[PDB]
Amino acid sequence: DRTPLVSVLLEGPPHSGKTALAAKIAEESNFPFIKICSPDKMIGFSETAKCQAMKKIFDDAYKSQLSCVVVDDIERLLDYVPIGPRFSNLVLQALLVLLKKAPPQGRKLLIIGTTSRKDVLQEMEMLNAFSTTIHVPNIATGEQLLEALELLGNFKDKERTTIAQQVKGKKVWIGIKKLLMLIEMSLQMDPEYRVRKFLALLREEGASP
Amino acid sequence: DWNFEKMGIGGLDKEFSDIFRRAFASRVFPPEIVEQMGCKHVKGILLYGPPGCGKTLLARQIGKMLNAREPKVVNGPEILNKYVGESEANIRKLFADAEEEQRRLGANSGLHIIIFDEIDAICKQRGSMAGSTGVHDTVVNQLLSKIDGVEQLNNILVIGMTNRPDLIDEALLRPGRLEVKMEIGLPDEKGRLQILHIHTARMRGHQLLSADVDIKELAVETKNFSGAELEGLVRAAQSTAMNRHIKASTKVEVDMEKAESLQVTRGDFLASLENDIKPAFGTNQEDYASYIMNGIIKWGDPVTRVLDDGELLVQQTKNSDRTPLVSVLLEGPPHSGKTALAAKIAEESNFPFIKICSPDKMIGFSETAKCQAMKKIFDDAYKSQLSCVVVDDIERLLDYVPIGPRFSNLVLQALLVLLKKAPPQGRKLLIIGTTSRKDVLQEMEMLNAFSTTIHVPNIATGEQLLEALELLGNFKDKERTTIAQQVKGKKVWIGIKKLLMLIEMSLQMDPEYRVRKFLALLREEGASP
Ligand SMILES: Nc1ncnc2c1ncn2[C@@H]1O[C@H](COP(=O)(O)OP(=O)(O)OP(=O)(O)O)[C@@H](O)[C@H]1O
Ligand SMILES: Nc1ncnc2c1ncn2[C@@H]1O[C@H](COP(=O)(O)OP(=O)(O)O)[C@@H](O)[C@H]1O
Numbered sequence: 165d166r167t168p169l170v171s172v173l174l175e176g177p178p179h180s181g182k183t184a185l186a187a188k189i190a191e192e193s194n195f196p197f198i199k200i201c202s203p204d205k206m207i208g209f210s211e212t213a214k215c216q217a218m219k220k221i222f223d224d225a226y227k228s229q230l231s232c233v234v235v236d237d238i239e240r241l242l243d244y245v246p247i248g249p250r251f252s253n254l255v256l257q258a259l260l261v262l263l264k265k266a267p268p269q270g271r272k273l274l275i276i277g278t279t280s281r282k283d284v285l286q287e288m289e290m291l292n293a294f295s296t297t298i299h300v301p302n303i304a305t306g307e308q309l310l311e312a313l314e315l316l317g318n319f320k321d322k323e324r325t326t327i328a329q330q331v332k333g334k335k336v337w338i339g340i341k342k343l344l345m346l347i348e349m350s351l352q353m354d355p356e357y358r359v360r361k362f363l364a365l366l367r368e369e370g371a372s373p
Numbered sequence: 374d375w376n377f378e379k380m381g382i383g384g385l386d387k388e389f390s391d392i393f394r395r396a397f398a399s400r401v402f403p404p405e406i407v408e409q410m411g412c413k414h415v416k417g418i419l420l421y422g423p424p425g426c427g428k429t430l431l432a433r434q435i436g437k438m439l440n441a442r443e444p445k446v447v448n449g450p451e452i453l454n455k456y457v458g459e460s461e462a463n464i465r466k467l468f469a470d471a472e473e474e475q476r477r478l479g480a481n482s483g484l485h486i487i488i489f490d491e492i493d494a495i496c497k498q499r500g501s502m503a504g505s506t507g508v509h510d511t512v513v514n515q516l517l518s519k520i521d522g523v524e525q526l527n528n529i530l531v532i533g534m535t536n537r538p539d540l541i542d543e544a545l546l547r548p549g550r551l552e553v554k555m556e557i558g559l560p561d562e563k564g565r566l567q568i569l570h571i572h573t574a575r576m577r578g579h580q581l582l583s584a585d586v587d588i589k590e591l592a593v594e595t596k597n598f599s600g601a602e603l604e605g606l607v608r609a610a611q612s613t614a615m616n617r618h619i620k621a622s623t624k625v626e627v628d629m630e631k632a633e634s635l636q637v638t639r640g641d642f643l644a645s646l647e648n649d650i651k652p653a654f655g656t657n658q659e660d661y662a663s664y665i666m667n668g669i670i671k672w673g674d675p676v677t678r679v680l681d682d683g684e685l686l687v688q689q690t691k692n693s694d695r696t697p698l699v700s701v702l703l704e705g706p707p708h709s710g711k712t713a714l715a716a717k718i719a720e721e722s723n724f725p726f727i728k729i730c731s732p733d734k735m736i737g738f739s740e741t742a743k744c745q746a747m748k749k750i751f752d753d754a755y756k757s758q759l760s761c762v763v764v765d766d767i768e769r770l771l772d773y774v775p776i777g778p779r780f781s782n783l784v785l786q787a788l789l790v791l792l793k794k795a796p797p798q799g800r801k802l803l804i805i806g807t808t809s810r811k812d813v814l815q816e817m818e819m820l821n822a823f824s825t826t827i828h829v830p831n832i833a834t835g836e837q838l839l840e841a842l843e844l845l846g847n848f849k850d851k852e853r854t855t856i857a858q859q860v861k862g863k864k865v866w867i868g869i870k871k872l873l874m875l876i877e878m879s880l881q882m883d884p885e886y887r888v889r890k891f892l893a894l895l896r897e898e899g900a901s902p
Contacts, residue, residue: 178821204794207744207748208744208748208783208787216501216502220501223501240786240789240790243786245782245785245817245818246818247778247817250782344695344696345696345824348689348693348696349689349825352685352688
């Protein structure tokens with residue numbers, strides 16, 4: 165009752181799977197009113213239109229005894245691009261004002277964010293508004309890679325052994341979505357050369373943490 | 374009576390049954406039980422889909438089915454007038470007969486039908502902010518007041534048709550107003566079969582069609598036709614058959630009975646298919662001739678490598694379930710001929726819907742117009758079971774110039790967003806980009822959105838240039854030997870288009886002095902990366 169408004173930021177490396185986890189949390193919330201404010205439904209909008217859309221979503225969110233709103237891929241809303249830099253000021257000011265506005269008496273709210281560039285948000289003095297942050301990591305060991313390959317269920321036992329013998333000798337750094345894409349790309353060759361191409365792609369993609 | 378087929382509509386099996394069940398189930402049941410229950414009647418429905426797929430026809434047929442009076446067709450753009458209180462007056466004139474007849478006859482009145490066409494051009498979301506009210510904030514208010522107001526009308530039905538179902542107000546779609554929504558999409562094989570039967574029943578009856586015409590074949594041939602396209606095909610075929618009959622009669626003194634025997638039509642169908650009808654949601658054969666103009670000549674292994682990689686990507690995007698969206702980027706030095714290979718891959722794709730987006734058609738356009746054009750192209754691409762879209766130059770769409778640097782941010786955001794949006798369930802897409810400056814793209818952080826990259830190199834050996842000259846076949850044997858001896862050294866660096874231009878320029882001198890000019894031009898050019 166002393167904290168009617170809460171916030172949280174989910175951040176990590178790209179191709180790591182943030183939106184899915186945010187949606188899963190929202191679904192498991194069991195709240196009467198759940199919404200998503202994504203940037204792919206505002207293609208071509210100017211600044212003021214985006215401001216109006218965000219305000220309209222939050223106005224509706226303010227008319228229920230409970231709520232939950234997800235703002236995902238913030239850096240797309242702000243219109244950021246490293247050259248310059250350049251971005252939109254009106255949207256940033258609107259978001260900063262809305263992140264600390266209390267609903268009418270007796271009602272409650274919860275906001276979840278998402279991003280892939282934490283430092284750039286830190287430079288704008290934004291992390292002073294979010295109450296806390298959570299970190300989503302990538303795959304960082306051969307055992308986890310083999311476990312994921314098993315759970316997906318693509319390769320046989322002999323191929324599992326062949327890949328393990330070579331891949332258990334060091335550490336790896338790869339996201340989950342990229343892993344699915346690599347598997348799908350590998351499966352287009354003839355049955356003989358599948359594992360070789362998979363290993364070649366994995367070696368090429370591998371980079372220092 | 375339902376008999377969807379008898380009425381004159383084919384391919385609408387479920388989008389008719391659901392309508393009949395949900396909306397019209399309380400108009401035909403015995404009045405006694407309906408009155409005993411005490412349930413009102415639905416007050417309208419909404420139809421949205423691609424143009425030319427048979428919406429207005431369904432509205433008129435529904436109107437005729439219920440013994441309703443003559444519908445009042447209205448066009449959305451025509452209601453607006455520039456004086457105060459003229460648009461509202463027009464919107465308020467359509468509901469006169471219903472009010473008068475209910476006031477007179479009590480509760481035994483008939484049924485009136487009103488058809489709004491392009492309902493999204495007068496009814497847009499109202500502006501909440503003070504001082505930011507729209508210009509058409511009164512038409513919507515008048516329409517909302519009339520549809521369901523203080524005085525009830527229980528003898529009306531409003532049918533609205535549109536194409537952009539997401540711009541319409543949200544107070545106009547609650548269960549009281551226009552509470553049923555339906556989608557009419559492009560017909561599949563069975564729908565085309567039914568439509569062709571409906572449109573050739575008359576010719577079959579009058580005994581004019583040949584015995585060698587097979588409707589199933591023509592059903593398979595047309596892949597993304599709508600109804601209007603099929604009807605136009607039939608009419609064009611019959612017209613060309615008439616023209617052939619007249620030509621045969623005039624050319625020769627043959628008996629008229631022979632001409633009437635020739636009145637049967639077999640080749641007309643294929644001729645019209647290949648030369649008369651141009652689908653909007655189908656492959657276009659007129660553009661590849663304008664991009665791959667001089668053809669693909671195999672001068673080395675790199676061409677084979679690139680084509681094989683493209684084929685692999687296509688085969689992946691066809692037969693996958695975990696990746697409905699795939700992207701690829703062709704990058705290389707200038708004048709290497711990237712657009713030609715991209716178009717060749719697209720042509721060899723064998724996909725129902727192929728389109729090319731290039732900046733040549735956007736001269737003088739402001740950035741917002743370019744955004745709208747790209748959005749429309751992708752929106753069209755989202756309506757087919759398979760697709761392929763080509764973005765020609767990703768460096769002129771941005772208006773990049775090294776000084777500054779200066780470019781347009783909004784188009785870049787549109788591109789970055791549109792490379793991640795997946796199509797509706799079950800449909801698949803493929804995107805091929807073509808660029809000449811990959812480093813600047815990497816600076817903008819666009820190179821991480823793509824999936825894979827392909828490299829298109831230049832000629833880098835003497836024997837490759839000699840083989841290219843052989844394939845082009847311009848110079849004779851002695852000049853061939855002279856050139857081969859001169860540049861046997863493998864330190865050449867030239868683009869294919871530049872090679873064509875140099876050959877054309879060098880050919881303009883007299884027969885004696887032709888090799889020297891070509892060699893001088895080649896030497897003047899660069900010789901290393
Ligand atoms: N193997 C080949 N690869 C590419 N183009 C070829 C080949 N053989 C012949 N050509 C011809 O070369 C020309 C290719 O020019 P194209 O328009 O693709 O250039 P480009 O690389 O897009 O140019 P720029 O980057 O300067 O805009 C076409 O006439 C094509 O017919
Ligand atoms: N399902 C169908 N079966 C047969 N013909 C159709 C069908 N749908 C459309 N047509 C043809 O298309 C023509 C025009 O359709 P139209 O009413 O203009 O559609 P829209 O509402 O998209 O403008 C009609 O005259 C009709 O012959």
